[PDB]
């Protein structure tokens, strides 16, 4: 009835998803990657082209291009995909807060809108998106960023939820909360909301880092998380989690692709407009963050 | 035997760069070569820890810095030459063909007319054969292109040497590496393997006892120096017997397998301005520019 296919990118450890309703052919793509080499400034389309090819092989029609949040670890390929498979690009409405902060950091100037108008749909908690016979509910789950959404898919429970970076596989734990607007106490509460779904609900992760050298994995369940999550299993209190997450964040370095990712993703994945020589430039602020 | 000169190398673990302090203890005059401003590309943060080590050693020696020398326009680290100039003095010098590098990379970074392509950001532009005085020592700039169009090898000798104090030291930049590691890549704009072969042959025509101080150690513990004799005998790429054509074929094939250096784009846009950072935008913040799909 629902088909979920994950596509793992070794360079950024991101899992992008194809969500398919067999009965209608209607499809959503979630958290796509535009391949980017920060050493050379080169972009490639190999990861997004794999999604396009699978869409075509399934005879699928893409209706939604969903972002769980404004990613700091890879560039989105949403505009590239929209041109080539269709669909509407959607993200949580609090992307506008990210635009305000990062528009300032990158000195984006007056041509860069802070109203989320680069996106087709801005989503509020509880909004639903139709996908053939399925319904996708946008559940606001802030903590890693203030804009994070978890997409809960059911027949219009036997549910699936795309949790973004709100959870990892149980053996890895939880995501950092030191992005601007991030908050560990919020993340704890948003995780408790996700783990309030029925226990057999499948949870699909945005990232996997293969702790202890195990195989790549990116699906868990609400039950397995409550039982085994190394940071936030049943029994862990909010205060204890906040203290752990805050200390753990304090010791982290900046994600390698933070500055390139955020300036692109805050524009719905559009690249900066060309300068007068016809070249587009990412801007890296010195000693500013 | 060896000059009276003192050479101390400072290895940076992040970039594998070796920066040098060259000291004439008799006069107290000093040169600093190939300094590093520490730079984290993930966050845009700079630090001065590497440069501060050079400053502290200069002060402990009672030395006075007269020269801040670059062997070439570096693609693997940002220079700290201006930060050093302000705090220890000295003139910043590089080979005159830096102007060619400025033409190419001024365009790549769209730096515009405020960025001069005449080398005026540097205090001294050096031609082959130029000598720089350093107390009882003399530094001869030998042009050794190949890795880049501008590379210089700085050959140091006592200006007026007794019989047993005639041996030279040369700071070779990224031409030769240690014998077991070979030679540097030649795929930077204006780089040329055939030129590099010829330049290395010139460096290896210096007297056999000449000490050769390396710009990097990529296999660190640290190996700072080789000699002309050892390089001619042992260098895995360009020992005696390797023909020019064979070296070019090897070097070309090898370059094709390499990725871009991590700091290539931040380094060249700062080092083409003698290590100055870009001027701030209207909001008071300085930005590095990363060209998309342009190189
Ligand atoms: Ca994330
Ligand atoms: Ca070099
Ligand atoms: Cl606006
Ligand atoms: Cl904050
Ligand atoms: Cl060329």
Swiss-Prot record, chain A:
<feature type="binding site">
    <location>
        <position position="207"/>
    </location>
    <ligand>
        <name>a divalent metal cation 2</name>
    </ligand>
</feature>
<feature type="binding site">
    <location>
        <position position="73"/>
    </location>
    <ligand>
        <name>a divalent metal cation 2</name>
    </ligand>
</feature>
<feature type="binding site">
    <location>
        <position position="165"/>
    </location>
    <ligand>
        <name>a divalent metal cation 1</name>
    </ligand>
</feature>
<dbReference type="InterPro" id="IPR036866">
    <property type="entry name" value="RibonucZ/Hydroxyglut_hydro"/>
</dbReference>
<dbReference type="Pfam" id="PF00753">
    <property type="entry name" value="Lactamase_B"/>
</dbReference>
<dbReference type="InterPro" id="IPR044528">
    <property type="entry name" value="POD-like_MBL-fold"/>
</dbReference>
<feature type="binding site">
    <location>
        <position position="165"/>
    </location>
    <ligand>
        <name>a divalent metal cation 2</name>
    </ligand>
</feature>
<feature type="binding site">
    <location>
        <position position="71"/>
    </location>
    <ligand>
        <name>a divalent metal cation 1</name>
    </ligand>
</feature>
<dbReference type="GO" id="GO:0006749">
    <property type="term" value="P:glutathione metabolic process"/>
</dbReference>
<comment type="function">
    <text>Probable hydrolase. Does not have beta-lactamase activity.</text>
</comment>
<keyword id="KW-0378">Hydrolase</keyword>
<feature type="binding site">
    <location>
        <position position="74"/>
    </location>
    <ligand>
        <name>a divalent metal cation 2</name>
    </ligand>
</feature>
<protein>
    <recommendedName>
        <fullName>Probable metallo-hydrolase BURPS1710b_2304</fullName>
        <ecNumber>3.-.-.-</ecNumber>
    </recommendedName>
</protein>
<dbReference type="GO" id="GO:0046872">
    <property type="term" value="F:metal ion binding"/>
</dbReference>
<feature type="binding site">
    <location>
        <position position="144"/>
    </location>
    <ligand>
        <name>a divalent metal cation 1</name>
    </ligand>
</feature>
<feature type="binding site">
    <location>
        <position position="69"/>
    </location>
    <ligand>
        <name>a divalent metal cation 1</name>
    </ligand>
</feature>
<dbReference type="GO" id="GO:0070813">
    <property type="term" value="P:hydrogen sulfide metabolic process"/>
</dbReference>
<dbReference type="GO" id="GO:0050313">
    <property type="term" value="F:sulfur dioxygenase activity"/>
</dbReference>
<comment type="similarity">
    <text>Belongs to the metallo-beta-lactamase superfamily.</text>
</comment>
<dbReference type="GO" id="GO:0016787">
    <property type="term" value="F:hydrolase activity"/>
</dbReference>
<dbReference type="InterPro" id="IPR051682">
    <property type="entry name" value="Mito_Persulfide_Diox"/>
</dbReference>
<dbReference type="InterPro" id="IPR001279">
    <property type="entry name" value="Metallo-B-lactamas"/>
</dbReference>
From Swiss-Prot, chain B:
<dbReference type="GO" id="GO:0016787">
    <property type="term" value="F:hydrolase activity"/>
</dbReference>
<keyword id="KW-0378">Hydrolase</keyword>
<feature type="binding site">
    <location>
        <position position="174"/>
    </location>
    <ligand>
        <name>a divalent metal cation 2</name>
    </ligand>
</feature>
<feature type="binding site">
    <location>
        <position position="76"/>
    </location>
    <ligand>
        <name>a divalent metal cation 2</name>
    </ligand>
</feature>
<dbReference type="InterPro" id="IPR001279">
    <property type="entry name" value="Metallo-B-lactamas"/>
</dbReference>
<feature type="binding site">
    <location>
        <position position="147"/>
    </location>
    <ligand>
        <name>a divalent metal cation 1</name>
    </ligand>
</feature>
<dbReference type="Pfam" id="PF00753">
    <property type="entry name" value="Lactamase_B"/>
</dbReference>
<dbReference type="InterPro" id="IPR036866">
    <property type="entry name" value="RibonucZ/Hydroxyglut_hydro"/>
</dbReference>
<feature type="binding site">
    <location>
        <position position="174"/>
    </location>
    <ligand>
        <name>a divalent metal cation 1</name>
    </ligand>
</feature>
<comment type="similarity">
    <text>Belongs to the metallo-beta-lactamase superfamily.</text>
</comment>
<comment type="function">
    <text>Probable hydrolase. Does not have beta-lactamase activity.</text>
</comment>
<feature type="binding site">
    <location>
        <position position="74"/>
    </location>
    <ligand>
        <name>a divalent metal cation 1</name>
    </ligand>
</feature>
<dbReference type="GO" id="GO:0006749">
    <property type="term" value="P:glutathione metabolic process"/>
</dbReference>
<dbReference type="GO" id="GO:0070813">
    <property type="term" value="P:hydrogen sulfide metabolic process"/>
</dbReference>
<dbReference type="GO" id="GO:0046872">
    <property type="term" value="F:metal ion binding"/>
</dbReference>
<dbReference type="GO" id="GO:0050313">
    <property type="term" value="F:sulfur dioxygenase activity"/>
</dbReference>
<dbReference type="InterPro" id="IPR044528">
    <property type="entry name" value="POD-like_MBL-fold"/>
</dbReference>
<protein>
    <recommendedName>
        <fullName>Probable metallo-hydrolase BURPS1710b_2304</fullName>
        <ecNumber>3.-.-.-</ecNumber>
    </recommendedName>
</protein>
<feature type="binding site">
    <location>
        <position position="72"/>
    </location>
    <ligand>
        <name>a divalent metal cation 1</name>
    </ligand>
</feature>
<feature type="binding site">
    <location>
        <position position="216"/>
    </location>
    <ligand>
        <name>a divalent metal cation 2</name>
    </ligand>
</feature>
<feature type="binding site">
    <location>
        <position position="77"/>
    </location>
    <ligand>
        <name>a divalent metal cation 2</name>
    </ligand>
</feature>
<keyword id="KW-0479">Metal-binding</keyword>
């Amino acid at each position: 009835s629902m088909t979920v296919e994950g596509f793992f990118d070794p360079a950024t450890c991101t899992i992008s998803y194809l969500l398919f309703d067999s009965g209608s052919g209607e499809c959503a793509l979630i958290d796509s990657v535009l391949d980017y080499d920060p050493k050379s400034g080169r972009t490639r389309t190999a990861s997004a082209d794999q999604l396009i090819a699978r869409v075509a092989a399934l005879g699928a029609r893409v209706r939604w291009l969903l972002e769980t949040h404004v990613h700091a670890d890879h560039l989105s390929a949403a505009p590239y995909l929209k041109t080539r498979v269709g669909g509407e690009i959607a993200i949580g409405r609090h992307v506008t807060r990210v635009q305000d902060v990062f528009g300032k950091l990158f000195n984006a100037g007056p041509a860069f809108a802070h109203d989320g108008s680069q996106f087709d749909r801005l989503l509020d908690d509880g909004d639903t998106l139709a996908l053939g016979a399925l319904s996708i509910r946008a559940m606001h789950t802030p903590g890693h960023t203030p804009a994070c959404m978890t997409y809960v898919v059911t027949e219009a429970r036997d549910a699936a939820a795309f949790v973004g970076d709100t959870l990892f596989m149980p053996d890895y734990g939880t995501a950092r909360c030191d992005f601007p607007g991030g908050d560990a106490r919020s993340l704890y509460r948003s995780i408790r909301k996700v783990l309030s779904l029925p226990p057999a609900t499948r949870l699909y992760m945005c990232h996997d880092y293969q702790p202890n050298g195990r195989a790549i994995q990116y699906a868990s369940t609400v039950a397995d998380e409550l039982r085994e999550n190394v940071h936030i299993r049943e029994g862990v209190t909010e205060d204890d989690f906040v203290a752990m997450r805050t200390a753990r964040d304090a010791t982290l370095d900046m994600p390698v692709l933070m500055l390139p990712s955020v300036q692109v993703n805050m524009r719905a994945g559009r690249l900066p407009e060309p300068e007068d020589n016809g070249v587009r430039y990412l801007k890296i602020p010195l000693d500013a963050i």
